[PDB]
Design an enzyme around this catalytic site. Structure first.
Site, short mmCIF file in Angstrom:
data_model
loop_
_atom_site.label_atom_id
_atom_site.label_comp_id
_atom_site.label_asym_id
_atom_site.label_seq_id
_atom_site.Cartn_x
_atom_site.Cartn_y
_atom_site.Cartn_z
N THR C 44 0.84 -1.21 0.00
CA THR C 44 0.00 0.00 0.00
C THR C 44 0.86 1.24 0.00
O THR C 44 0.59 2.23 -0.72
CB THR C 44 -0.90 0.03 1.31
OG1 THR C 44 -1.52 -1.28 1.48
CG2 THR C 44 -1.93 1.14 1.20
N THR C 45 1.95 1.25 0.79
CA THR C 45 2.82 2.40 0.89
C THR C 45 3.54 2.61 -0.46
O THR C 45 3.92 3.75 -0.69
CB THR C 45 3.84 2.14 2.02
OG1 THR C 45 3.11 1.90 3.21
CG2 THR C 45 4.70 3.31 2.25
N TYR C 133 -2.49 -10.09 4.74
CA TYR C 133 -2.51 -8.69 5.16
C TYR C 133 -3.93 -8.30 5.55
O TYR C 133 -4.84 -8.27 4.70
CB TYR C 133 -1.90 -7.90 4.04
CG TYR C 133 -1.86 -6.39 4.09
CD1 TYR C 133 -1.99 -5.65 5.26
CD2 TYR C 133 -1.62 -5.67 2.91
CE1 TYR C 133 -1.88 -4.26 5.24
CE2 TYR C 133 -1.52 -4.31 2.90
CZ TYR C 133 -1.72 -3.59 4.06
OH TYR C 133 -1.69 -2.22 4.03
N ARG C 138 -9.01 -0.02 5.86
CA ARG C 138 -8.90 0.23 4.45
C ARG C 138 -9.80 -0.67 3.60
O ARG C 138 -10.26 -0.23 2.54
CB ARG C 138 -7.47 0.04 3.96
CG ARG C 138 -6.47 1.06 4.46
CD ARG C 138 -5.12 0.75 3.89
NE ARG C 138 -4.13 1.75 4.24
CZ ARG C 138 -3.93 2.89 3.61
NH1 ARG C 138 -4.68 3.20 2.56
NH2 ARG C 138 -2.99 3.76 3.98
N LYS C 161 0.35 -9.81 8.47
CA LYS C 161 0.63 -8.37 8.67
C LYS C 161 -0.68 -7.85 9.27
O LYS C 161 -1.68 -7.73 8.57
CB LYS C 161 0.95 -7.71 7.36
CG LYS C 161 1.18 -6.18 7.53
CD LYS C 161 1.47 -5.52 6.22
CE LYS C 161 1.58 -4.01 6.30
NZ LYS C 161 1.78 -3.45 4.97
N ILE C 203 6.04 -4.59 9.35
CA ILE C 203 6.10 -4.14 7.97
C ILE C 203 5.71 -2.72 8.01
O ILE C 203 4.58 -2.35 8.40
CB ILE C 203 5.21 -5.02 7.07
CG1 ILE C 203 5.80 -6.45 7.00
CG2 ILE C 203 5.11 -4.38 5.65
CD1 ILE C 203 4.92 -7.50 6.31
#
Lengths: 291, 291, 291, 291
Positions: C44-45, C133, C138, C161, C203
């Site tokens: 996502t980052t 994840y 989100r 995560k 993470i």
């Protein structure tokens, strides 16, 4: 039903040492002249929490006696202690109240099973109509539509003051209970949608400042003049929302004082608004032609 | 407005390897005959996520072409990538769509500032009406009434499909935007309260199985027959709720197959219902005389 | 385990027409020198959402190839379309990735039953370790501890995560899965409590700007130097929180540019910070001696 | 600090008509023998809500007197009425309590400004250490870390019992307040992560049934035996969670009776567990070798 239309959750005006009964009398007379349909005394907006048992009883009795049967009077009698709720409810019945507003337990909370027991215990003790008050944002506890379905055939349980803000939930209550559980909005910004789902009125904060408009909104909608009702809802919405910008009744009491009504100060833990919020409230009061 | 009343968020029936255009044709004709007011193609209920770009385009174009201007067709064209949203929107415009259903970003999300930039970027690329789609329970992101107020003067931004389920928010949108932003309910169990606040219809899951009833509910309310409308809402509520007992469109496709419509299977990550939930759905379909 | 300690969720630096590979190479080298334990590329980052399929593949491959086995490389390969997630995951495996970061479905969502099917379908397709994840804020979807329990005996499913922010939930995952599901924090402000519950690393967003501190925090805690680790967590907390004052990666990319790293602009729907938030970020950068 | 380690939020055993002081005596001695570090009397778990003022006073005084300075005794003295909170707090101080557990207002609530006024009013009236009790899931009100930072320099405000379950918030409190505000977990399933963030103990429900284990968990962690501590947390987690399957103290009193402790019945609105939940509780008590 106990009443239809606008039931004001009246403030309790305080002196710095007690209850301002002279002011409360003035407000009563004003509400009767302004077409308020009912008075709910010692609700949340009335700061029952910070009144002594004697102040509560004297205030409830005062309202009953001054109204003198001209409109219905409903008293807040519930607490988070069932024995205490029974005793207060019996008391209010004994002095001629027309209805009891009985909150769910709060803080201690309970299960849905316990809610049935609580409400049945209070009902079993009285022969006066009961309005269940659901306000999970304050209590931490939501009484479900299924639990309401279990309670709505009880002789005394006639209505719910639904302050969840969850419109889905309110639809479900109506679908399950029908005429066995009248629905009053417990949020002023939700009157129209709740009336549209078959609600019969509102137990209102906003009616403390604009009682005739709240009455008219309800009467219009219930008479099928739905567009005219909606216009009042939307024209008053910004003011309505300003009345919740801080914990009610901080804004409404502030507003009434801004309107020159001289209703005194709040009791701790309630307190004066912050600067920014006060300015929003003033803005909306002015825009609605109230100051 | 693009349409008033019941807009079906039509399912996409799949074969084992692609889209069942023959079944889609049948559904389209059935909607037209059943008085559905509009078709929304490749919305959430249409499983656009799990369709290829070619499948989406072919399906959207098929619906447009088959409908042949009989009722309005709106296509889902938004995604969480602004460039992609622009491209798909321009494409749908080019093949004659009547409106664009454009979701907020989801998963990546953005700020309210970013939301204005996103929707303006899409709008600036097209000359077709846009319906903003707000569904925070799916996207993680709520577009606020204040953000909508910034967008509603945009030439193409004409409506919102409001699926927040927050009736206070919907009142605020109406109060701020008025006629500059039509409101469609995005939740079938909220049609009545949303119409009561000045909404003009619904983009509906329920209309996939009871199109005529959803159309009638809206028509009746909008024509002032509010009690008649409310009855349909309440009588269909348990079925409506069953259609969301699992992630939509799991229940509605399941239901359509139970109703012998032969609309195929769901694409992963959607899957078959669990036993208990299937049972609930079956119960409500039978109670509503659908199977 | 795939790695222990700090795994940076690296940004994707963009030119105005594509990926800035020269800058990405610089960041890789810097992370290796700064004791970063792993690189997660196209998370996502990394703004995978707004990259084309070709950009994603080229970027993932670039990182793999430049790292050249010096530390583990994990690629974001999941989407909300199961077929697409399988294809991307196969692809990443075929070019030598060390692990796959596979998000839950988002927006379309699915049931817990569907989550099991989704993850099993992806796992069945590969022979590379998978990190599930979970980021419900989100995605709109929380994979439960019970569902994780059903997945953790899968050969390839090695870790989660956990970005729910729900510490109770993370305790439950550890209790149920033990060593069968390694836990990585997915929130930088929660590293210490998650390591305390038996997590093995993070993470990290924060590692984009202070990689050695994040590595040290983890290494200290995992080596029993818990007080020294906590001090880094608390001393960096205000900066950490500033990195989420707007949707990540808006702040981190802004921060890196403030730090003279020349990492380019965000892709819509992401955009520049507002003035007040930018000033908070600057304040915290300065207070941490970063600018 | 008032204490470190395990503070039991002791139940109040009732007879049919009052408090079972004989049973309370036995529990007190058992706690002392079991290495409980402190007793919190007439907290939530003690059913203070459903006790009269005389029952509360007698119970608090009984615990103080029986304990006879062997371990610290903390009394619940707060309510949602500031005047009442002051009075009760001064009373408890006057009979030798070691600390005051003072909840935020609940149900009526207040603003953050009001919270500062409330806690300062209480503090200014006493010269006894105060533990702020934050439990928004019960009260509807979250005291923020910024508000705590305004209060933590107050001479008497020495700790918070943090029951929000929000581990990010707890990190923020520690970062802002440091040693000026000790943190006790208010959730038994969060002891380890809270101690990891620099908390000093727990005010515990679980300690009513496994006092020695809760004490050991804390001691081990605080002495650096973090893995040993974690094992106790994880091994007791399913029981811990069972103790919250219904509103506390419903499960813990039920459990104590299943363990043959003869602690009497709950007071309405609390009541007996439902069948399924009783079963779960029984399962976990048996699995933990308690019955």
């Amino acid at each position: 039903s106990i009443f239809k239309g606008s039931g004001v959750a009246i403030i309790t005006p305080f002196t710095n040492t007690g209850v301002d009964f002279d002011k409360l009398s003035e407000l009563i007379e004003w509400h009767i002249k302004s077409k308020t349909d009912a008075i709910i005394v010692c609700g949340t907006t009335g700061e029952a929490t910070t009144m002594t048992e004697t102040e509560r009883k004297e205030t409830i009795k005062f309202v009953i006696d001054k109204v003198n049967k001209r409109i219905p009077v409903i008293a807040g009698t519930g607490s988070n202690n069932t024995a205490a709720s029974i005793a207060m409810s019996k008391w209010a019945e004994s002095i001629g109240v027309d209805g009891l507003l009985v909150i769910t337990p709060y803080y201690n909370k309970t299960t849905q099973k316990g809610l049935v027991k609580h409400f049945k215990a209070v009902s079993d003790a009285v022969s006066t109509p009961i309005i269940i008050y659901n306000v999970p944002g304050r209590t931490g506890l939501n009484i479900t539509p299924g639990t309401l379905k279990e309670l709505c055939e009880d002789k005394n349980i006639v209505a719910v003051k639904e302050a969840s803000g969850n419109i889905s939930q309110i639809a479900q209550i109506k679908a399950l209970c029908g005429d066995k559980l009248d629905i009053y909005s417990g949020n002023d910004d939700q009157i129209i949608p709740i009336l549209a789902l078959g609600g019969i009125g509102v137990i209102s904060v906003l009616a403390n400042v604009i009682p005739e408009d709240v009455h008219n909104m309800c009467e219009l909608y219930l008479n099928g003049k739905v567009n005219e009702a909606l216009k009042i809802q939307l024209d008053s919405l910004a003011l309505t929302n300003a009345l919740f910008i801080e914990t009610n009744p901080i804004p409404v009491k502030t507003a009434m004082n801004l309107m020159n009504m001289k209703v005194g100060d709040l009791r701790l833990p309630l307190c004066e608004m912050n600067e920014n919020n006060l300015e929003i409230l003033k803005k909306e009061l002015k825009a609605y032609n109230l100051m």
